[PDB]
Ligand binder design. Structure first.
Ligand code: HEM
Length: 154
């Protein structure tokens, strides 16, 4: 798929708001993911024990990782589709070391859209949401194709 420039603008205009507080957004997102789809919590041997949302909010580690996720995603979005290089190492560690099913990349895509909608209603109307959705679908389709090349499937 190809996003137009007007779609990329809508995605990079709400991402610039997310970058004013990356640690807060990365925390909200991960918690939204772990409450909605608790099975995803099992993939993190590092956070697995966290039992409540309050524990999650207090974990500094969890907040550090949220910043790692959003920094890597932001670097991919800012490429505006030319992200092949960035994708490579990310597809290799998530398909071979962490074993993360595409299904779980959809679940986090859903958590990102829920959090931007709650924090940025004015910059995240229907057109901007459609554009963000298109950009994450593009990210998931390219990762899925690398997963096949790398041998991960089902
Ligand atoms: C927007 C999507 C995502 C991005 C941009 C992302 C990115 C990252 C980055 C940059 C790291 C550090 C380096 C590495 O191991 O590759 C990482 C590690 C990891 N990721 Fe992801 N991730 C994403 C989605 C997920 C999802 C959905 C799961 C789980 C359901 C997942 C599970 C993990 C695990 C288990 C680790 C190792 C964490 C730790 O032990 O240090 N990732 N991820």
């Amino acid at each position: 798929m190809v996003l137009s420039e007007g779609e990329w603008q809508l995605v990079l205009h709400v991402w610039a708001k997310v970058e004013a507080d990356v640690a807060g957004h990365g925390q909200d997102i991960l918690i939204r993911l772990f409450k909605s789809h608790p099975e995803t919590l099992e993939k993190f041997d590092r956070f697995k024990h966290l039992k409540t949302e309050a524990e999650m909010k207090a974990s500094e580690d969890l907040k550090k990782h949220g910043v790692t996720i959003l920094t890597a995603l932001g670097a991919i979005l800012k490429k505006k589709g030319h992200h092949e290089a960035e994708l490579k190492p990310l597809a290799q560690s998530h398909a071979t070391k962490h074993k993360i099913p595409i299904k779980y990349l959809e679940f986090i895509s859903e958590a990102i859209i829920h959090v931007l909608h709650s924090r940025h209603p004015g910059n995240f109307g229907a057109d901007a949401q459609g554009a963000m959705n298109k950009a994450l679908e593009l990210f998931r389709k390219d990762i899925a194709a690398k997963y096949k090349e790398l041998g991960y499937q089902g």
